[PDB]
Amino acid sequence: MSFYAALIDLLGRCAPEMHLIQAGKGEALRIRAILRSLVPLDDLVGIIS
Amino acid sequence: RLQESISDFYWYYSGKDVIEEQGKRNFSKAMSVAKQVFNSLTEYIQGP
């Protein structure tokens, strides 16, 4: 449990940036697409239970 | 490899209009090195 929880903690703060860049650029959107494609939201929402 | 680096540097400044002061201080550093290399290449050929 410690491992996988800590890994997603890393890839939640390794996010591209706050919306200061994500709303006025097109480079950071490439990174956001990658990390979002590795953690499906359907399973993630159910894990908080 | 140095030539591929300067040409590269050019694209980063292709869309701007004025080169800031720290965009020239480093740039002149590289071009001075390239001149010294070119001087050497001549002196292996001079005196056929």
Next chain:
Amino acid sequence: QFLRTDDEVVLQCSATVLKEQLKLCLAAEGFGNRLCFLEPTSNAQNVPPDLAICCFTLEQSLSVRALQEMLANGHRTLLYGHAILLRHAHSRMYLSCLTTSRSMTDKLAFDVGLQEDATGEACWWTMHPASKQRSEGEKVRVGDDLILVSVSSERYLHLSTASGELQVDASFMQTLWNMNPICSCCEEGYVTGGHVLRLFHGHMDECLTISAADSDDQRR
């Protein structure tokens, strides 16, 4: 001698199945199937391979920077580390990578597909040398071995085999691709292979043909 821009070429991969090597190329039909599949070319002496849709062509070659600065807005020679823009010759559509889900591998598969993507976001690849013999900034010898990586998604184009048949995607590891110079800038007014053309006979108006449509002769 060496690869150049505006040249028509074909991809090639080699993966044994029955303990014997089978050559597999990459091709897609175009109109009606945005996906891509594999075409075996191991029994040319008996099975005629379909090379009408396997032809590709190289149109652009740029450094990564140059690409990224162009994103905001002759004849060169390929070097390892540069980018590339594939282009299917027949359907005139650009090879790219889609964002759909499929294949056993699934996971980060992101199955390959070509739609229209002239817009430069996911239609570009960078190539790297396979073994330690080569290095960056070196000229590309004809018949080398390449490793291709998507610029956008950053996944190797993987020959992902599974329980079913052989499928292609970009998920997990490397895939050794060997290039192949189908042709180059030919001379004008001379017959070359792979053309589609008519056969006149006689002097003025006579040509080869087959029987007309809507008949039981089965065009024999």
Next chain:
Amino acid sequence: FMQTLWNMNPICSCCEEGYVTGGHVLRLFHGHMDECLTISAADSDDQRR
């Protein structure tokens, strides 16, 4: 006690520099920079085969 007919034999002569000649002892690199032919290491039952 007696004679012995000896016939001479020109194995070689003053060869040219920088060219491979027979009877030399030398190494076999492969690839580009650092790779060469070899056999298994010492102290093994493989009998160097």
Next chain:
Amino acid sequence: CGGERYLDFLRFAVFVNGESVEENANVVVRLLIRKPECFGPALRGEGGS
């Protein structure tokens, strides 16, 4: 056990004070993806997720 220690270090090099510094963060994800074995084999693999 070992993995939870290396990753704890990386958390301190992606952000410094309130979700900032992305240059090193950008290269972390582009480098971590290159080695898929870095992910725990329970997911991000060929068998199952």
